[PDB]
């Protein structure tokens, strides 16, 4: 009676930004075309990113309507909130609609809603707005998780497991929706982490249906959530920062995180796969959260992973950017689709067991052991 992923939907904002054109565009819309050396630095980051496309709610049009969001640190929170309290529930609704469509069962069988969002802190929360938009049952048991952020794709699976498995018959709608409206801001010489923010992070929403003991007649598991564990890396608070301030949500990533993550991954991995008797990290399938290309490269190097093992992850980062909590869930989708298309034995690239990991502020590592199905 393991909690299982039964259906997966994803969505993105209408507006697509090619990375090759994003430097030119960004420094124009932020009134920063004069800082030529900094625009050149940003070119270099973009082209080290391996991000080809991102989808952003923000447009040039929206930025003339809200000039404060286009500056570096002018007061802009109220504007960002006006955008996001409205837009977060709509994109969440799109991704969830798609998941429910795949699932094929009525919205009335949904008993739990776990909703993860960095954006749009509101009372009542974007979860209530989503209940009304999507037409969910008023008795739906809600868990609202604000501003966690980038590892929370594992946090939602961790909470979904206990919720699905302790409530007989439950069906849990999990939604991660990440908009960069609250973190977007113009460039600055003195703020280097912010250039990384501006080249890597895109928008996206992902939603899954989790339940334990599916009805094989109407439902089939895609992945089973075997176990889920969170941990704090010692002495690394302030290696990922941010606060909601009057200038919106600030951001700092330290230069240690790719190597720090690569140095802590094996304890997490041993803790997770000892009870299964797995030691060969090339024999499981992989869904690490691609905070950037270097986290992936350091993971590859430290574990001796074969070149193919992160194809799905690199595909999501490439085609959508880093979408914070949602990214791993896109990776879920990408892998199962891919395995059908190649006619693999199982949903997880033909292997039986896999790992999903999220890395975020803390530094926090979320480790989820997944079981493939077919």
| 49 close to 18: Cβ distance less than 8 angstroms | no
| 187 close to 139: Cβ distance less than 8 angstroms | no
Polymer length in residues for the chain: 374
Distance CA 291, CA 261 (A): 11
Contacts of 144 (CB under 8 A, 6+ apart): 115, 125, 126, 127
| 127 close to 144: Cβ distance less than 8 angstroms | yes
186 phi, psi to nearest 5 deg:
-70, 170
Q: What is the DSSP string of 18-66?
A: EGGGHHHHHHHHTT-TT-HHHHHHHHHHHHHS---EEE-S--HHHHHH-
Euclidean distance between the first and the last CA atom of the chain, given in angstroms as a whole number: 17
Of 355, 339, 244, 252, nearest to 303 (Cα)?
355
**Eight-state DSSP code of residue 326:** G
Of 180, 178, 191, 177, nearest to 22 (Cα)?
180
Three-state secondary-structure class, residue 368 = strand
123 phi, psi to nearest 5 deg:
-120, 115
**Eight-state DSSP code of residue 171:** -
Among 26, 150, 176, 268, the active-site one is 150
Token pair of 56 as six digits: 């952003």
CA distances from 326 to 66, 148, 246, 288, 329 (A): 26, 12, 26, 12, 5
Contacts of 356 (CB under 8 A, 6+ apart): 153, 154, 157, 287, 288, 328, 331, 332, 366, 367, 368, 370
Cα atoms in the 13 Å half-sphere on the side-chain side of 277: 1
Cα atoms in the 13 Å half-sphere on the side-chain side of 193: 15
Contacts of 143 (CB under 8 A, 6+ apart): 112, 113, 114, 115, 159, 163
Strands (DSSP E) found in 190-249: 204-212, 223-232, 240-241, 244-245, 248-249
Three-state secondary-structure class, residue 281 = coil
Of 62, 263, 44, 78, nearest to 70 (Cα)?
62
**Eight-state DSSP code of residue 300:** H
Contacts of 126 (CB under 8 A, 6+ apart): 85, 88, 89, 92, 115, 117, 119, 120, 144, 177
| 130 close to 202: Cβ distance less than 8 angstroms | no
Strand partners, 181: none
Helices marked H in the chain? 22-29, 36-48, 60-65, 77-103, 126-134, 152-166, 193-200, 257-273, 293-303, 311-320, 327-341
Cα atoms in the 13 Å half-sphere on the side-chain side of 326: 34
228 phi, psi to nearest 5 deg:
-150, 125
* Residue that the structure tokens 């301030």 belong to: 245
Q: Is the dihedral of CA 158, 162, 165, 168 positive or negative?
A: negative
Distance CA 128, CA 125 (A): 6
H, E, C per residue of 146-170: ECCCCCHHHHHHHHHHHHHHHCCCC
Would you call 116 a catalytic residue per the annotation?
no
| 50 close to 318: Cβ distance less than 8 angstroms | yes
Which structural technique was applied?
X-ray
CA distances from 111 to 143, 170, 174, 216, 220 (A): 11, 6, 11, 19, 18
Distance CA 259, CA 272 (A): 20
126 phi, psi to nearest 5 deg:
-60, -20
Contacts of 40 (CB under 8 A, 6+ apart): none
Q: Which domains does the chain have, with CATH numbers?
A: 3-212 (3.40.47.10), 223-371 (3.40.47.10)
Distance CA 72, CA 76 (A): 10
Distance CA 119, CA 107 (A): 25
CA distances from 328 to 29, 147, 207 (A): 30, 17, 11
Neighbour tally for 349: CB within 10 Å: 21
Token pair of 10 as six digits: 């994803």
Pairing of strands 16-18, 53-55: antiparallel
Helix crossing, 311-320 with 327-341: angle to 10°? 120
């Amino acid at each position: 009676g393991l909690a299982s992923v039964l259906a997966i939907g994803t969505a993105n904002p209408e507006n697509c930004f090619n990375q090759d054109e994003f430097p030119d565009l960004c420094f124009r819309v932020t009134k920063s075309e004069h800082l030529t050396g900094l625009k050149e630095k940003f070119k270099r980051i973009c082209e080290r990113s391996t991000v080809r496309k991102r989808y952003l709610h923000l447009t040039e049009e929206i930025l003339q309507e809200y000039p404060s969001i286009a500056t570096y640190n002018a007061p802009s929170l109220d504007a960002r909130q006006e955008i996001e309290v409205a837009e977060v529930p709509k994109l969440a609704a799109r991704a969830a609609s798609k998941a429910i469509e795949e699932w094929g069962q009525p919205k009335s069988k949904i008993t739990h809603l776990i909703f993860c969002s960095t954006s749009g802190i509101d009372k009542p929360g974007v979860d209530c707005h989503l209940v009304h938009l999507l037409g969910l049952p008023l008795s739906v048991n809600r868990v609202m998780l604000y501003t966690l952020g980038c590892h929370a794709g594992g946090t939602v699976l961790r909470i979904a497991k206990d919720l699905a498995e302790n409530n007989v018959g439950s069906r849990v709608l999990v939604v991660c929706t990440e908009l960069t409206v609250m973190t977007f801001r113009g460039p600055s010489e003195t703020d280097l982490a912010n250039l990384i923010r501006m080249a890597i992070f895109g928008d996206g929403a992902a939603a899954v249906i989790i339940g334990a003991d599916p009805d094989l007649s109407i439902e089939r598991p895609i992945f089973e959530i075997y176990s889920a564990s969170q941990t704090l890396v010692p002495n690394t608070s302030k290696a990922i920062h941010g606060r909601v301030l009057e200038m919106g949500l600030t951001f700092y990533v330290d230069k240690m995180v790719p190597t720090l993550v690569a140095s802590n991954i094996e304890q997490c991995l041993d803790k997770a796969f000892s009870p299964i008797g797995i030691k060969d990290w090339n024999s499981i399938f992989w869904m690490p959260h691609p905070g950037g290309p270097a986290i992936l490269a350091e993971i590859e190097a430290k574990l001796g992973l074969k070149p193919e093992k992160l194809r799905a992850t690199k595909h999501v980062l490439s085609e959508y950017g880093n979408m914070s909590s949602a990214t791993v869930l896109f990776i879920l989708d990408e892998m199962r689709r891919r395995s059908k298309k190649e006619g693999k034995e199982t949903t997880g690239e033909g292997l039986e067991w896999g790992v999903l990991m999220g890395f975020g502020p803390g530094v926090t590592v979320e480790t989820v052991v997944l079981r493939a199905i077919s």
